[PDB]
Every structure is written in C-alpha cells, then in structure tokens.
Amino acid sequence: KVFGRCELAAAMKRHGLDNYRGYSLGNWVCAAKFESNFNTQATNRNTDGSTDYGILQINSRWWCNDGRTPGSRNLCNIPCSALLSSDITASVNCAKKIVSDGNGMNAWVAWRNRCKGTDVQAWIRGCRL
Numbered sequence: 001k002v003f004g005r006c007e008l009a010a011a012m013k014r015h016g017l018d019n020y021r022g023y024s025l026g027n028w029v030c031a032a033k034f035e036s037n038f039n040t041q042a043t044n045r046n047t048d049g050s051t052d053y054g055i056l057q058i059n060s061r062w063w064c065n066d067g068r069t070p071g072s073r074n075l076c077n078i079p080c081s082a083l084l085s086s087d088i089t090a091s092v093n094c095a096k097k098i099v100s101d102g103n104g105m106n107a108w109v110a111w112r113n114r115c116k117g118t119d120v121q122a123w124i125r126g127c128r129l
Ligand SMILES: [Cl-]
Pocket: 015, 016, 088, 089, 090, 092, 093
C-alpha cells in the first residue's frame, strides 16, 4: 500500500508514534517518505547481505527474520514479511523498540541525513489529526 502523507500521519498517530521518545509525528512521516516513499512493500538489499523492509525500511541484520541474513538477530520477533503489510502495526511496534535502543532515530540513515534538524512539522501541515 502506498500511503498519502496525511493518511500515514494519522495512522502513525493512532499507533502512538507522535512524540514517541520525544520525536514529533513529523519526524516519523519524514523518515517514512525518505525510506520508502510511503510504500509498505518497499524492500532494498544492503551491502552486508541484510535487507530493509517496509514503510520504515527496518533491517534484517538486527530486527527481523528473512531466512537469508546469516549471523543476524530478530529483536522484534517477527518475520520481515510482516513489515510489508498494508497494516503498519508490526512496523510501528518494531520502530518503537529500535528508537528506544540508545541511538534514537539516528538508526534511520535517511532520517539523520534528510530530516534531522529540518522543519519536520511541514510533513504534517494541513492534516486532520
Ligand atoms: Cl502499534
């Protein structure tokens, strides 16, 4: 599923991401935009052989089991395929564990390079939340 901007914001807010660990909703929407272009089915392979999955491009090296990432962890206790659903529950649940791990949203390279220190509020401008 390819979300609309405000549609995703509203879904993220319902699942409790708005100011989760102090990250305003706009941070999350910005991260999603630059990770997946709001596409729940996005997959990209990393140089290490791990793969990133879903709306927030969660990585198989640490967070999910894709059956093909030797020496990896499954810290969200999920198959990576769960991260590709039109229902964003697994992605958001797992994102909350990632961002609580010490490094915050810096775990998302696109957030660090494209969203961090920007006017992220613009990403929720106009939306009914
Ligand atoms: Cl959730």
